[PDB]
Every structure is written in structure tokens, then in C-alpha cells.
Ligand binder design. Structure first.
Ligand SMILES: Nc1ncnc2c1ncn2[C@@H]1O[C@H](COP(=O)(O)OP(=O)(O)OP(=O)(O)O)[C@@H](O)[C@H]1O
Ligand SMILES: Nc1ncnc2c1ncn2[C@@H]1O[C@H](COP(=O)(O)OP(=O)(O)O)[C@@H](O)[C@H]1O
Ligand SMILES: Nc1ncnc2c1ncn2[C@@H]1O[C@H](COP(=O)(O)OP(=O)(O)O)[C@@H](O)[C@H]1O
Ligand SMILES: [Mg+2]
Lengths: 518, 107
């Protein structure tokens, strides 16, 4: 049978069936018929996927599903330690237990399963982007060389399938390869049922803990973090009884502890990090005119398009305007309004002092992470500061520009969706750098122009009384103004310190001294 | 419950209860119910802050509050010796005794 639910495995249902069919099948049917065909058994399996998705569990469970001996373990980088050749001889001795037993019993020996961890370090040894060549050659010779070995099996697992050299993934060597991905809602429900089983075996769980609700609450989780959530909930519930209540039977777990753990304890690695938005949207958003409404409507239309389209899986948009106009505070809100499971912000604030290579790796890593989820939204902040642009000569970095241009057109893999929002302050330079023909649409964020809008914004904020309002309006309505919102906040805060009598006057002075502009 | 003041520490009051509850509530409590719980015990803690705030003073007090063995010590810049392989030997030796104790007459 294929009962992968009673052994611990959860979401994995098709990978197991296919792997068992293709590899662990030649050794199940009667020996006589197999000998009559005389077909060589499979001698390699490869696994790849995001970390902590249930890889080692399957590897160790498969052996016990068969009948083999102690499964060995070897680390990837450790094999490429200070000494090689002696470690190659240690590899030879690692397989010698099966070697001697093989020649002693050619066709009547058991399975000698060896598991490889981080096979990328051992192999690969690229000359782009020495001592290890000896190890790769030795491993290739031992796995499939002049000598014939039949009673062994190699299972390798990694996180970067592309780095695997093409020499290994050829017939005879590791051939069957599988992907393990993040679970969907069904996988989450199955995993939660598996882990929360013993608890129901002793009436230690309250009746208000609905697994179905928890399944829909957690989005883009991993099995390890689900186990961590269960552990945290148990710990909180138990600590509730090592306190003012009874000191060292009336013990149960309540949904309140589960919700508290969700909101305070566990932070997913492929999820919406809520703590990051407190430092980019501080004073909220206030409707001082029509442009705010127009921009928000455009953003919502873009989100709706990308969510319900099949022929346009990639969409990008660029926000541009004069300096000090609130560009980074309207992009974050647009991203947050959508309920996309995966959201991230790549900003220069976290790359103070990097070289020109670290930036490319960081950007590629962010965009690589964004691909695993089935719905994403990534924000790039202050592109010009990202390119290190200074208008004397001028000077900038070519590598970052090329990486950005290439990345802004690569479609998402297979059947997923994406949305990229950019921010900038000097559109003409981007026009001359050819970037502007890579984005799909543009939006203009204007500044405050007329006195009425200034009056509306000042009233909505709220700092001046009726008399001061009328006094300010008397002068303001007689001319036209040009100033950004952030500067308005700064001027109000600076003015408010003065004594009540002079406040108005002071403010007026500032607006006259700085308001000189078209 | 714990009253920090008499243990030789004062001021690190709020940031004590969080760690206590999170990672040390399962090394107490009647073991029989814990057997059914099946929960495993945490095996890691990280502390960060400016120098000279009492980080070391907390470890030697947590050690003598759980009825444990004496604290082993290690340094970072020294274990990064030139000898590659002997550093692994030091790493092995570090756990040797605890590994041996778990191997025999454990639980
Ligand atoms: N309707 C609004 N639109 C934009 N910002 C607003 C609005 N209402 C209030 N604000 C506040 O204005 C500020 C806009 O963000 P911020 O000060 O970072 O400007 P910015 O455009 O990102 O600046 P820069 O591009 O020069 O770095 C935030 O404090 C935001 O709270
Ligand atoms: N599909 C799953 N079903 C049940 N438990 C899981 C599943 N995926 C992960 N886990 C839990 O999370 C842990 C993940 O560890 P593991 O997969 O061995 O890490 P890695 O894949 O990096 O070697 C396991 O110990 C297991 O208890
Ligand atoms: N909260 C505290 N209460 C009492 N003494 C403290 C506290 N924090 C630091 N100290 C004093 O600092 C001295 C050394 O602290 P130490 O453990 O070396 O800190 P660190 O290792 O972080 O520099 C001790 O003698 C101790 O008395
Ligand atoms: Mg900005």
C-alpha cells in the first residue's frame, strides 16, 4: 500500500507514488520474473525544494518502508575538508561494507542506503561567477565505473538544482529527480491533523480549537513552522498553570493561546512581515484632493488585473514626481491594500557600504525567493540611489543597471504571477538610460498648487483655530503656492514651537521664504 | 515564580519573564502530564545587546536555577584555528562528555 499518512508524511502524495513506481519497483515483484528480464535497478535519486519542507523525513521513511540496514549520513562541505584522498579512502570504506558483502553474495545481498546532504558543495566546482575535482572524479568512478556494484543506492538532496553539474544527471547515475514544494491548504490541514493527534488521545484539547479555521488563517507556511506553532501554543497553555493558579488535571489548550502565538511568537519566512510597514507609512494618508483618489484607483485596477488574468502574468508600474511629494508612502499602501500572501520591500537602507557585487546577489536572492509563492508583490525603492548616480560627469554602475533591466522582463516560472512597483525622482535620466521602455505604465504624483487645497489639508490635519484659519486664508487666496506635503508637515511642526501670539506670523514668513518656485 | 532581585540581577525584569515562559516552562511542571504532551525541549537561545549590560551574568544564574551541571566555556576567535580538522576535533571534544552521558543511563 501507499499509506503515506500513517508514517508522518503530509502533503506529499504524488512525489511518493512516482518515486516508488519508478525506482522502488524493480525489487518488489517475484525474483524469478525479474531475473528472466534481467533489468538493472535504479541507482540514484535527486530531491530539490525550499528548505524545511519535509525532505529528510521521506528519505528516512522510505528505507524503513523497505527492509535495509542502518542508513549512513555524510555532510556535503565536510567531505571537502583539509584532507582529500584519505577522505576519498574513507568514502571507499563507507561503501566497502556493501562492496565486500556484494562480492560475497552477488545476487543475495541487502540494500546499503547512503544519504547525501548538500551535494552541491561536493560536486559543481564551477569556473564562473581545484582540490574538489579529485573528489568529483572519484565519486563518479565509484558510483558507476569499471567495477559493477548492484546492492547500493544514493539519494541526494539540494536547494539549488541548477548548480548541479550535468555529468551526474545522466542514465545509470542519478536519473529520477523530484521537487518538493510548499503545501497548499490541504497539506496544512493534513499536517496539523498528524501533529495534533496525541493531544486528543487523552482529552487534553478543548472543543473550541477548530483545525479548519487555523488552516485558512496560516498562509504560505512550512511544516517546521507549523510544528513550532503547536509547540508555542502548548507552552503558553501550560505556563498559564505554573502561575497564580495551581502550583507545582484541569489542563486544556484554548484557541486564545493559538491566536496569541500566531500574532506574537512565530514569524513565517515566506509571508507578509507586518512589522516592516510601521516605518514607511507613519502618518497615514489624508484625502486632500482628487489626485490621491485617482492614484489609488489606478493601483487597485492594476492589482485586480494581475490577480484575474491568464495572458499577462507579469505587470509593472512606475511612480514618479517632484522631490518631497510622498512617493514611498503611496506605494507601500498600494502594496498593502492587496491581500497577496507574499510581500517584500528591497530598499537601499539595508545596503550601506556594500560593494557592487553584493547588491546584485541581494536583488537576485529577493527575486528568486519571490518566485516560490503563487502570488507576490515586490517594491523597489529609490532606483537612482540604487544605481549610485551623481550628475558630475556623470558616474554610475553598469552591473546593477544590466541586472535590473534583465530582471524586469523575466516572466515568472510555470504558472505563477507577479507585480513590481518602482519609485524614482528624476525621470529624464531614466529616459536616457533606456530603463523607462522596460516598465509598462507610468503614474504622476503632483504637488499642492492652489490655496483651497492648502486650506483643506491644514484643516484636516488640525493645528489652527478659526481665527488663524481666516487670517491665513486672507493672504493665501491672493496668490498660488507650490510645495510638497512633507515640507508642509515640517513647516507646521517648526512653527508650532513659537509662542501663541506669533505662531501665525512665523508660519507665514516661512511659507514666503521657501515658497519661491514655479 | 521568580523574584530576580535576590539572585544578583536587577533591571532586566521584563526581558526575563519572556525567556522564562517560552523556553523554560517545559523543564518544570509535573513530568507525567508532559509525557502525554510529547513536546520537546528547546535547545537554543540568542542574546544581543551593547557590551557591559549583564549578558554573561544571566547564563551562570540560569544554570544554577535548573539544577544543571557546571557551564562549559568556548571562544569564537580561538576555535577558528589554522588547523582545519583539529577544529573539528575540538568541536567533538566539546560535546564528548554529554554525548557519552546521553549514550548510557540516559533519559
Ligand atoms: N496623501 C498623502 N500622500 C503622501 N504622503 C502623505 C499623505 N498624507 C500624509 N503623508 C505623509 O507624507 C510623508 C510621505 O512620505 P515621505 O516623507 O517619506 O516622502 P517621500 O515621497 O517618500 O520622500 P523622498 O522621495 O524625498 O525620499 C509620510 O509622512 C506620509 O505619512
Ligand atoms: N509534510 C510534512 N509532514 C509532517 N511533518 C513535516 C512535514 N514537513 C516538515 N515536517 C516537520 O518539519 C521538520 C522538517 O525537517 P527536515 O524536512 O528534515 O529539514 P530539511 O528538509 O531541511 O532536512 C521535520 O522534522 C518534520 O517533523
Ligand atoms: N543587571 C545587573 N545587575 C547587577 N550587576 C550587573 C548588571 N549588569 C551588569 N552588572 C555588572 O557587570 C559586571 C560584569 O558584567 P559582564 O557579565 O562582564 O557583562 P558583559 O559580559 O555583557 O560585558 C558584573 O560584575 C556585574 O556586577
Ligand atoms: Mg523617497
Amino acid at each position: 500500500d501507499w499509506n503515506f499518512e500513517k508514517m508522518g508524511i503530509g502533503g506529499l502524495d504524488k512525489e511518493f507514488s512516482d518515486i516508488f513506481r519508478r525506482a522502488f519497483a524493480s525489487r518488489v515483484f517475484p525474483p524469478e520474473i525479474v531475473e528472466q528480464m534481467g533489468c538493472k535497478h535504479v541507482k540514484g535519486i535527486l530531491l530539490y525544494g525550499p528548505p524545511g519542507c519535509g525532505k529528510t523525513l521521506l528519505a528516512r521513511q522510505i528505507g524503513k518502508m523497505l527492509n535495509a540496514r542502518e542508513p549512513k549520513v555524510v555532510n556535503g562541505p565536510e567531505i571537502l575538508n583539509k584532507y582529500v584522498g584519505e577522505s576519498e579512502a574513507n568514502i571507499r570504506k563507507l561503501f566497502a561494507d556493501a562492496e565486500e558483502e556484494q562480492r560475497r553474495l552477488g545476487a543475495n545481498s541487502g540494500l546499503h542506503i547512503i544519504i547525501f546532504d548538500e551535494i552541491d558543495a561536493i560536486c559543481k566546482q564551477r569556473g564562473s561567477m581545484g582540490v574538489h575535482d579529485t573528489v568529483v572524479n572519484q565519486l563518479l568512478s565509484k558510483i558507476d565505473g569499471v567495477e559493477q556494484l548492484n546492492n547500493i543506492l544514493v539519494i541526494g538532496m539540494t536547494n539549488r538544482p541548477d548548480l548541479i553539474d550535468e555529468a551526474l544527471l545522466r542514465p545509470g547515475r542519478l536519473e529520477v529527480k523530484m521537487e518538493i514544494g510548499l503545501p497548499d491548504e490541504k497539506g496544512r490541514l493534513q499536517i496539523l491533523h498528524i501533529h495534533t493527534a496525541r493531544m486528543r488521545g487523552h482529552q487534553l484539547l478543548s472543543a473550541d480549537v477548530d483545525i479548519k479555521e487555523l488552516a485558512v488563517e496560516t498562509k504560505n507556511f512550512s511544516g517546521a513552522e507549523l510544528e513550532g506553532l503547536v509547540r508555542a501554543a502548548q507552552s503558553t497553555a501550560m505556563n498559564r498553570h505554573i502561575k497564580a493558579s495551581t502550583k507545582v488535571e484541569s489542563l486544556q489548550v484554548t484557541r486564545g493561546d493559538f491566536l496569541a502565538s500566531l500574532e506574537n511568537d512565530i514569524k513565517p519566512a515566506f509571508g507578509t512581515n507586518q512589522e516592516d510597514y510601521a516605518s514607511y507609512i507613519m502618518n497615514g494618508i489624508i484625502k486632500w484632493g482628487d489626485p490621491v483618489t485617482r492614484v489609488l484607483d489606478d493601483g487597485e485596477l492594476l492589482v485586480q488585473q494581475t490577480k484575474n488574468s491568464d495572458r499577462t502574468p507579469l505587470v509593472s508600474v512606475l511612480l514618479e514626481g517632484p522631490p518631497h511629494s510622498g512617493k514611498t508612502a503611496l506605494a507601500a499602501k498600494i502594496a498593502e491594500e492587496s491581500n497577496f500572501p507574499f510581500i517584500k520591500i528591497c530598499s537601499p537602507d539595508k545596503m550601506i557600504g556594500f560593494s557592487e557585487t553584493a547588491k546584485c546577489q541581494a536583488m537576485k536572492k529577493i527575486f528568486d525567493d519571490a518566485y516560490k509563492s503563487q502570488l507576490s508583490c515586490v517594491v523597489v525603492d529609490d532606483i537612482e540611489r540604487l544605481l549610485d548616480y551623481v550628475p558630475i560627469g556623470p558616474r554610475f554602475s553598469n552591473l546593477v543597471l544590466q541586472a535590473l533591466l534583465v530582471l524586469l522582463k523575466k516572466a515568472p516560472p510555470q504558472g505563477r504571477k507577479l507585480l513590481i512597483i518602482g519609485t524614482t525622482s528624476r525621470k529624464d535620466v531614466l529616459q536616457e538610460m533606456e530603463m523607462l521602455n522596460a516598465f509598462s505604465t507610468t503614474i504622476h504624483v503632483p504637488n499642492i498648487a492652489t490655496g483651497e487645497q492648502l486650506l483643506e489639508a491644514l484643516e484636516l490635519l488640525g493645528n489652527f483655530k478659526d481665527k488663524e484659519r481666516t487670517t491665513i486664508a486672507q493672504q493665501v487666496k491672493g496668490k498660488k503656492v507650490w510645495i510638497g506635503i512633507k515640507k508642509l508637515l515640517m513647516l507646521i511642526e517648526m512653527s508650532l514651537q513659537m509662542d501663541p501670539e506669533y505662531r501665525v506670523r512665523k508660519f507665514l514668513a516661512l511659507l514666503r521664504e521657501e515658497g519661491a518656485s514655479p
